[PDB]
Design a protein around this ligand. Structure first.
Ligand SMILES: O=P(O)(O)OC[C@H]1O[C@](O)(COP(=O)(O)O)[C@@H](O)[C@@H]1O
Ligand SMILES: O=P(O)(O)OC[C@H]1O[C@](O)(COP(=O)(O)O)[C@@H](O)[C@@H]1O
Ligand SMILES: [Mg+2]
Ligand SMILES: [Mg+2]
Ligand SMILES: [Mg+2]
Ligand SMILES: [Mg+2]
Lengths: 501, 501, 501, 501
């Protein structure tokens, strides 16, 4: 079993060593980053099956993101395996501020009376939590007495009992025991804060990440196709048209506009953290199944995100509900499953990726029996898609160890992946940007190779690259597709069934 | 809209008021039990959708259990609604003992060296953990070095590093941070402790339970049909033949013998806490889907259990993986979903029941689209089952608000329930024991009524009881089944499609 | 096996004895009809499974039709079984005339030069065949040199080589050996003769048949819904609204207008004789399958007609192609199969009905495996149809010997028949016109009984009538439907599964 | 549009010109055979769609058969198209003998008393019918009084009223009007004549046939696999191992042993004439549908035979039941439809082939909608069959005009044919024997070409041969399969989707 379901792992301090100390150790924050020791930890997550690392720009600053991206470039070399680089934007969001004196968080008890500030550009204290509102908007008049302020995926609730005009502070009662840490997501349900089109901060974050070299952007709180097209414009103007945009669906407007968002984007991230606060929590499983189906029908990538192995933040074993969630995301048809705090923030980042890889690998064996996606229903809209349908058929008719596609742009590999064959897909492509671009497609193992010449045997190349990567051995049956011959073929036009020598 | 998926709520101190104090408040345990304030609390759980309470005999003593059962009996009169009474057995298991000087539990850090004792009838120290082993078995010779000892559904791991012959103690390294409380599960995977057929303790607990008045027994660690038959023999012997037995499947032996266990039992509880430590965690979802399908095909009851809303033990809102888990259990075909520590041991027992109820109600609306069960594949093996298939056909042909069955024993209601009609099922029955015994069947609303005479119009009765229960109004279409006429019919033989006037 | 597929048998001289002589014997035509001896022959066709007799008004005169109808009324009394009375109209057709000197036919050889007259109201001779054109139309100018004149379902072809203006005769070459008999169908393909709306002759024929007492009219060459509504108007004005209209589809205009014709009519007769000459012969099997499907979807009656056992006109055994045709008409979903010359004109009328009954009975056993009709696809458009769906389901779930419906108008019996249950359908109705009206519905055995009173047990009546008709015995399982109670029920609202005592 | 369903046409005097005279013209038999005029006639049958001619060795002598086979060989050069040569064996059967004084046949009326003789090597009189019994068996002791003797596929019945010991004759009553000709079938249902394993006569006929050059043998009255293996042994012994054996199923024993016969044979001829006298006539359609399904699942050829256009023996147009029969045989899944007396013995042999071809072409357009065969259910049991499944998938995904297979032995063409793709199949093969042997496979157009070298581009070759045959034009999409490269490939291993330039 190669793992066909892709893992997005969020990076953060959990994997980072600072002056020989690990996250949680006394004096950790007084040290600087040990890049090699950090890259060694990250190389172990790559080996365990992380296919793409997520850099959440709601956390840290550019320097911290930039160094973390450099640490992954080193980790790839140590692992001898490449991964995707995914930037996750702030979007039209509210975050808790940094605290005075670089305290990182405080703990609160049910019934404490604290304040939430609206004034922009200040720091929090334990008693007066300051907000970073996208567009530096003033939200004091948008939030009435009786509104709930939710901190960190709704873990901690603050009930607005009064408003203090002298300070423009919400007077709040802590509804339940919990923590307020710096740069935490804030939700105020049933309010209609007028966030701008694309915040200056998002424009700067995106341009910085594009300069560092990324493959993917996940756009937070996509409301309409315009939100995706604003980011697309920046990618194309900076010479970064190869970068793929995943719309994060995490509010009613995103659900209402799903069809236009899917057409504009390269994929969807089902951002269930915010989604289950911005829409009825009991509706998230309905939307999850429907989004995965539509995205797969469009030949695009879907990521299922948030709380997948939440307990593994503190404990070496997931709950029964967490394992059920990962398993059922695979059965629903997801291309990729995501870790957030499990990998970024937790005591068991490596064990989290391992555990997720084990569940994903066991669930992929039940797709023939239980799988929700139905490739038989698709219209085959092009001759490459006809070929992808024929490859699925061959992998259904007999035991195929591997499908190999020689793909210039990844088009053939994406269409084979869409049909969910009962085989791994080796995608041989001829440039690194295409190779990294395929790292979140179901079943696709991207591999860089030289562009075939008109004298090359592409079928010999396919078998040799598969053997040299240890994916197949003598006697295995593989399906190879290619455009034959090189420099005459318009598209993938040939399928070969080949016994490996 | 009526909740078709049934809720088993485990009762515990979480819902109990002690001289004005709630569970988790200073000096809670000092106070006498406020029976009436406790019954008012339990009454809210009934109103929120708890269909059966679970009395877990692994905790407390006969006095405590018997008191709790009496308090539920008052809660029913407050709520104006009856519930099922389910006894959950200790079973062939290992618990932690009570601690010296009524200390409730202790906390341990990774690398800590402590001891686990095999001598029976002793109480635990922080530094030496006593075991209450079923059958007071000496297990010291059963447990090799390098074996794993897990406490509290596997939360805390203890590696056996050495064995002390002179005290017959395990010298154990704490693997991970966690808590050792009183009367918690201990799992030693891949050991073969020869636990008795039925332990004296279980025999005593079942007999006390039967004396108090119960509807269900959930038998822990059912290994073979013999485990079910020993308990069935006590039910019959004491005149409690109406008591239904759910086999808890929570190890490989239970899985291997599942078919003969389903045949001996009235139902299966999928006990996923133990199951996911005793077998590979990533297989539990495979077994959950297969058990629900098999139990439904047998016309019996399936309960999905453990960790369903786990985070709500400590937080007012569940994680996205927990909502996914509850939803997917309903889609899989579960008759019932269960709360353990969420209702027994948590800060949010009412909100846990409400949340589960909300998810279960939403999931039931997607069983047409997504439902795994397939009633079309069933053999109809009796004339009542043919009537059940016809009822299901009527609810597929047109919009039926309610199915009404006049059922002496519940057999017709159980068959209609097996077919999962697109409608609520009102089961009009003539005794309280039959009424309570239907409370875990999917979609069944048990209601007590006078046995109709051969003078009575049972179709008028059905409509009148459905209107009086506020399940239907003028213009609603209903399907009524009955054995016509009373004193001649030997079974349900008539189906009526009626418009409520 | 009761035969569920209905047989329409065409009556003619084959069954008629004249002064002790049988059809074909010397001096036969010099005798008058022996009514009792003729009614005895016809009683044997009823016993063999003829459900409806067809009186083809293209043949004979009113007196001959009237006496044949009287002979069947006697045959019913002798057989002790009722049959339907079906009148088949001339329609907008061309027929060969009577011959001079009551010669009935002549024989011709390939290459003979004869004439066809256009002058209306004259008799034929061997050398000059006169036409009876509906509306007494003059067709001399509508038929050019090179047209084909086809006699008798296209058995004999006449090529128009010249036109003689002095006599207004077509000069024809006999294309193949064959016969021209009196009152034979004539087709001239690729001509557009302007037949009127409803010929005076058809108006008189219909009114005569309505006076004699008929159940059905098959309207020849239905072109549009107007053709059906013209006949409907006459039925309603004469107090004969109970008479059912079957549109004969036998030309392109009928195929083009099929949907409006089905909505206007009570059923379709697939008149393949003319159809296979008026449209491409290879298209008739396509249209047959499509018409049966649409008519069944409309809850109406379909008859498959012509050449079904053609060889049995002269021989005691059908060809392999004939048996295949009857079998496949049943598999396609036909309510009824028809005999024409086999019963009207042949040496083996009784053996023809027997042979057809044997094929139909063997094919009805393969409907579950091979049957084309798909009741699962129907929308259930009324509560009686919901009940019909539920009856189908019961007959699919277990072995049901009989479905009994107490039906005032036949509505419940038609809807049960539409769903094609795996059981015979006993339709108990309370007037003879309804009883005869159901004789061509698939599976329906109509039986006359007294209208139940409010003190009657309709379920006891259903079982008693079924037992007394020898359809069921002690131990058989039957499904009874009724509107319960009499004088309150709006519709069939009750289904009972009953073991016969 | 190309005819996918293949036509077997039985040759006979009907197509033979004798010194200027056609069959059925006065003094036909006086004249010498006009070989060249006969070959011109047979050439028209080839052009009209005859794919194989059947030489029925129950008629004539080696001289007659050998001459006819030579005349077909000239017809091929005239038509410019090859056909298959099928020998149909006499088999373990009873024929009528030749009559005294070269009288061709006699006519008999019902109630006529005549005799049937058991003495072998004598010629028939009108009043005493000699039998040519296979093995020259004496059957007098095999045939009881009240047994039925049927002549000419059961047209004429003869009741055995008494047995004459002194002449060993049956005294027989004519049951029905009909004809006793020379060398006609005699069936005595429910007798057990111990016919040899393989008769000397069959051994001689097969050996003569093989010496002339044939592609197929149809073995009459195959009872067991042993009947097939005796003939296979002669084919192998004489170096004729390429000859394909169709078992004729025409009695209950053949039906009972069908599975072992399909396994021994290359195909089944459903010989319905005999079958519908030897088993109940109404079962033939049940057996026809089941045989076609089984033979197709085995990847072998099925021929549906007898009475398909029977009326066209005497009339230029077929009945509606005959067109229904041909159409339904195609829908059932038949590879081939057959003409017997229609082509051999009739007035309209060319028109019979044309008519069958027209119906077969129309029916093939409805196999998507109505087709009984289901290729989705098949096990794909080899890599060539996986390629066949993939080809079928491509023709379902997009509009493919043609499938082209470069096939050494026809194995790839036979598998593609088994899958019934929505396309014609051009089979490019390198020898005439393989070419002719594919002529009865559904959809296969065999074409002879040079064996490609490892220098050649087989995909260019495929396109060029398809264009040269006028099967495709510029812009048409085609699927080509081949073993790439020649001299390395051990099987068809490549599929190409190509647009014709
Ligand atoms: O078959 P489709 O969907 O029209 O795609 C054809 C396009 O795909 C491509 O072959 C690219 O495919 P690959 O990147 O997989 O090689 C283009 O060259 C071609 O224009
Ligand atoms: O259920 P539907 O299709 O509305 O039909 C209802 C009608 O059918 C009838 O019950 C007649 O049915 P029967 O003739 O079968 O008794 C009418 O009384 C009633 O108005
Ligand atoms: Mg979010
Ligand atoms: Mg347990
Ligand atoms: Mg007609
Ligand atoms: Mg034969």
């Amino acid at each position: 079993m190669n793992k066909r379901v892709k893992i997005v792992a969020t990076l953060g301090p959990a994997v980072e060593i600072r002056g020989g100390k690990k996250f949680g150790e006394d004096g950790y924050w007084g040290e600087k980053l040990d890049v090699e020791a950090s890259a060694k930890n990250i190389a172990k997550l790559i080996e365990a099956g992380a296919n793409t690392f997520r850099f959440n720009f709601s956390h840290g600053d550019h320097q911290e993101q930039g160094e973390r991206m450099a640490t992954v470039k080193l980790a790839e070399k140590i692992a001898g395996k490449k991964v995707g680089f995914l930037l996750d934007t702030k979007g039209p969001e509210i975050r808790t501020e940094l605290f005075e004196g670089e305290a990182k968080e405080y703990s609160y008890k049910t019934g404490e009376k604290i304040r939430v500030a609206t004034k922009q550009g200040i720091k929090s204290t334990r008693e007066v939590i300051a907000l970073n509102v996208a567009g530096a908007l003033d939200i004091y008049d948008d939030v009435e007495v009786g509104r709930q302020v939710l901190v960190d995926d709704g873990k901690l609730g603050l009930r607005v009992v009064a408003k203090d005009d002298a300070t423009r502070e919400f007077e709040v009662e802590v509804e339940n025991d919990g923590i307020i840490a710096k740069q935490k997501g804030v939700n105020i349900p049933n309010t209609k804060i007028p966030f701008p089109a694309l915040a200056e901060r998002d424009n700067d974050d995106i341009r910085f990440g594009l300069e560092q070299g990324i493959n993917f952007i996940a756009i937070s709180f996509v409301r309409t196709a315009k939100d995706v097209n604003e980011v697309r414009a920046i990618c194309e103007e900076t010479g970064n048209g190869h970068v793929q945009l995943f719309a994060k669906i995490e509010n009613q407007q995103g659900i209402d506009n799903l069809d236009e968002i899917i057409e504009a984007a390269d994929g969807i991230m089902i951002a269930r953290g915010d989604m289950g606060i911005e829409v009825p929590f009991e509706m998230v499983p309905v939307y999850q199944k429907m989004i995965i189906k539509k995205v797969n029908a469009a030949g695009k990538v879907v990521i299922t995100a948030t709380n997948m192995l939440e307990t593994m933040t503190e404990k070496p074993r997931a709950t029964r509900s967490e394992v059920s969630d990962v398993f059922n995301a695979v059965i629903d048809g997801t291309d990729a499953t995501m870790l957030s705090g499990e990998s970024a923030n937790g005591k068991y980042p490596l064990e989290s990726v391992t555990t997720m890889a084990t569940i994903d690998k066991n669930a992929q064996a039940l797709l023939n029996e239980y799988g929700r996606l139905d490739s038989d229903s698709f219209e085959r809209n092009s001759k490459t898609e006809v070929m992808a349908s024929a490859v699925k058929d061959a992998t259904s008719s007999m035991d195929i160890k591997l499908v190999v596609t020689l793909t210039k742009t990844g088009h053939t590999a994406r269409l084979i992946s869409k049909y969910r064959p009962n085989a791994d897909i080796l995608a041989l492509t001829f440039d690194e940007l295409t190779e990294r671009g395929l790292m979140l497609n179901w079943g696709v193992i991207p591999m860089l190779t030289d562009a075939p010449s008109s004298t090359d045997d592409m079928f010999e190349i396919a078998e040799r690259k598969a053997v040299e990567a240890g994916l197949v051995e003598s006697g295995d049956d593989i399906v190879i597709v290619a455009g034959v011959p090189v420099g005459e073929a318009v598209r993938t036009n040939t399928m070969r069934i080949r016994t490996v020598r």
